[PDB]
mmCIF file of N, CA and C and ligand atoms in Angstrom:
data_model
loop_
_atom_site.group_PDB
_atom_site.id
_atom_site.type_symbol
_atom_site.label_atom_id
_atom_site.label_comp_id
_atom_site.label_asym_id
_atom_site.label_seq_id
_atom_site.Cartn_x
_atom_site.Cartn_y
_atom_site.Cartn_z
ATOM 1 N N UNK A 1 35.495 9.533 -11.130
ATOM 2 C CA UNK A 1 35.392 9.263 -9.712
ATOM 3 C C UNK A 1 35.753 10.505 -8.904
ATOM 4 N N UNK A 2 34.828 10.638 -7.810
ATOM 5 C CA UNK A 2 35.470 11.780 -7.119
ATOM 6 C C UNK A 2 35.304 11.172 -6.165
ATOM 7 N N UNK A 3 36.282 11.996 -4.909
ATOM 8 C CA UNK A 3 36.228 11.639 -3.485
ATOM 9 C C UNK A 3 36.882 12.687 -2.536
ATOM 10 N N UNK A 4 36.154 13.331 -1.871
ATOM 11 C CA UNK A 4 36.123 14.612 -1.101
ATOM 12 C C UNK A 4 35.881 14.574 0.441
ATOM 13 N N UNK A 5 36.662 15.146 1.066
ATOM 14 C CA UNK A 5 36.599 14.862 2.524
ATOM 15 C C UNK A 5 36.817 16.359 2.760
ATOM 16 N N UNK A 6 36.143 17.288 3.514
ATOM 17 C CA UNK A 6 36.308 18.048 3.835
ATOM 18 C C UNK A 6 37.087 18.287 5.121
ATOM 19 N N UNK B 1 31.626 7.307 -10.058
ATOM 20 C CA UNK B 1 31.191 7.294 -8.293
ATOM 21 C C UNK B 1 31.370 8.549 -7.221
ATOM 22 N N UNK B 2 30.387 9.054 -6.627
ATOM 23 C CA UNK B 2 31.157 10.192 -5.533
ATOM 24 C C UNK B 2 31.077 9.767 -4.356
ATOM 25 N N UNK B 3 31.904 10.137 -3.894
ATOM 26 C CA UNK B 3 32.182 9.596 -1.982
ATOM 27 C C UNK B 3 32.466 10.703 -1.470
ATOM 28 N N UNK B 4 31.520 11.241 -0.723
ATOM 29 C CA UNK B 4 31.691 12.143 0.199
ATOM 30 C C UNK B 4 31.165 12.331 1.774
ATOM 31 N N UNK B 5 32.779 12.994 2.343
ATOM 32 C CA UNK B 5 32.623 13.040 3.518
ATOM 33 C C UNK B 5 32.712 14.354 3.741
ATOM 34 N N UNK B 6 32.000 14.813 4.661
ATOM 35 C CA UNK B 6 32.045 16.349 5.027
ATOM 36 C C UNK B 6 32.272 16.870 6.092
ATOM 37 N N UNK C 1 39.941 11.328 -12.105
ATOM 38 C CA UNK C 1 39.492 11.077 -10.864
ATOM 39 C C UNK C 1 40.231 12.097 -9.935
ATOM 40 N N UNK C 2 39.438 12.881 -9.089
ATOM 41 C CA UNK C 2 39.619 13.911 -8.063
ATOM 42 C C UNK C 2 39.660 13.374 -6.805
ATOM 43 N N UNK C 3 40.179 13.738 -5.958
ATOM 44 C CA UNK C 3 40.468 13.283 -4.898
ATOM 45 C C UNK C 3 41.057 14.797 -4.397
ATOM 46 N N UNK C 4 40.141 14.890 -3.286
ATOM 47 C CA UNK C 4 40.183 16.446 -2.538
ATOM 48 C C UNK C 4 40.097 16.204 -0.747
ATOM 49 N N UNK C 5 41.012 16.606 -0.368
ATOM 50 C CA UNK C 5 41.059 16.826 1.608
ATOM 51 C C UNK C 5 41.252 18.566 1.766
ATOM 52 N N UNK C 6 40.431 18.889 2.395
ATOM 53 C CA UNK C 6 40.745 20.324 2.652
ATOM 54 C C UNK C 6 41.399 20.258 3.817
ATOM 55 N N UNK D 1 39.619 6.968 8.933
ATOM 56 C CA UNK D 1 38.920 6.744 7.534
ATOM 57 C C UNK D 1 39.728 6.053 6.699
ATOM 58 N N UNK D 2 38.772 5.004 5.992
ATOM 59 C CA UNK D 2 39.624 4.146 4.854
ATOM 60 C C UNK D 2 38.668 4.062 3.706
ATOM 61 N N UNK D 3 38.676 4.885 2.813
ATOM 62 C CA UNK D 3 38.021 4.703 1.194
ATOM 63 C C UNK D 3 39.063 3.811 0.566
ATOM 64 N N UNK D 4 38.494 2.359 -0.141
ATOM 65 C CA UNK D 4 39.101 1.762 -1.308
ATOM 66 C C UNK D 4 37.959 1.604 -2.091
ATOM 67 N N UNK D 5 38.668 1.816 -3.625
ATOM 68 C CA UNK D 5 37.659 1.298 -4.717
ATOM 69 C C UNK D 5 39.089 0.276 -5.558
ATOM 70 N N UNK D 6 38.793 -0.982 -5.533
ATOM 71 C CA UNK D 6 39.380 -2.204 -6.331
ATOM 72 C C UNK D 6 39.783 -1.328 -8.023
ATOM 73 N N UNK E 1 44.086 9.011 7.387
ATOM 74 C CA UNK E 1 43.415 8.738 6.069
ATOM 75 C C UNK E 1 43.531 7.909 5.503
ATOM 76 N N UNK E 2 43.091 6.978 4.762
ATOM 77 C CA UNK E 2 43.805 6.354 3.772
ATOM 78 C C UNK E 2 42.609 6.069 2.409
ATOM 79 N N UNK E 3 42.984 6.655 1.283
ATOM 80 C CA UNK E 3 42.254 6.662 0.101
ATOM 81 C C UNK E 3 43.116 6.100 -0.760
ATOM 82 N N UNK E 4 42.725 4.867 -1.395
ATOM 83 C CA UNK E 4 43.223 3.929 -2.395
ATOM 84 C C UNK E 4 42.313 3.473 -3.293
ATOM 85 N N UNK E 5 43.249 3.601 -4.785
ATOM 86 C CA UNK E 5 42.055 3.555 -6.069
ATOM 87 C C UNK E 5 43.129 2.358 -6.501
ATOM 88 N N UNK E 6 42.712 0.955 -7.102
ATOM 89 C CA UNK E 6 43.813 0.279 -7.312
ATOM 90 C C UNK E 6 43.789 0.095 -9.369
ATOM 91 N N UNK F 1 48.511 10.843 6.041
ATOM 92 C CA UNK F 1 47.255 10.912 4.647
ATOM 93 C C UNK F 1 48.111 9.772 3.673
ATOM 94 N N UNK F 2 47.744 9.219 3.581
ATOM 95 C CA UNK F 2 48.346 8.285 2.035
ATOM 96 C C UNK F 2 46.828 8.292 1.140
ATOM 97 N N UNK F 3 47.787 8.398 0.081
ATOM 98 C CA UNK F 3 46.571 8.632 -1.141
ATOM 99 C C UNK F 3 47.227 7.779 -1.951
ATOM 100 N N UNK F 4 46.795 6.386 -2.556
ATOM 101 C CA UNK F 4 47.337 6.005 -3.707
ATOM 102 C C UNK F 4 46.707 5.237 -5.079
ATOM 103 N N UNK F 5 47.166 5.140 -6.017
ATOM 104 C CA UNK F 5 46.775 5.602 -7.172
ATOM 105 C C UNK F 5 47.693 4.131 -8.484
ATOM 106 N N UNK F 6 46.754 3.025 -7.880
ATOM 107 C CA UNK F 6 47.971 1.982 -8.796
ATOM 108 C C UNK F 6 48.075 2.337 -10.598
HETATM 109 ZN ZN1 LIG G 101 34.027 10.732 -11.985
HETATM 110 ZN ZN1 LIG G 102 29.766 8.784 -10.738
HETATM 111 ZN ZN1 LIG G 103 38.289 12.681 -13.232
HETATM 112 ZN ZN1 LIG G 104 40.192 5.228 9.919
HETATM 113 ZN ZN1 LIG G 105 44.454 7.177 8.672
HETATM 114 ZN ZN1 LIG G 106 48.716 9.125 7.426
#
């Protein structure tokens, strides 16, 4: 799982 | 899963 | 699982 | 912002 | 923010 | 930011 918020 | 916010 | 906030 | 994964 | 993996 | 991780 990824999860990226810049 | 990817979740991305940018 | 990654989990990234710049 | 609110990401959940169960 | 709130990111939750349960 | 809360990030959590049960
Ligand atoms: Zn993955
Ligand atoms: Zn995937
Ligand atoms: Zn991983
Ligand atoms: Zn919000
Ligand atoms: Zn918040
Ligand atoms: Zn907060």
């Amino acid at each position: 799982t990824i999860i990226t918020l810049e």
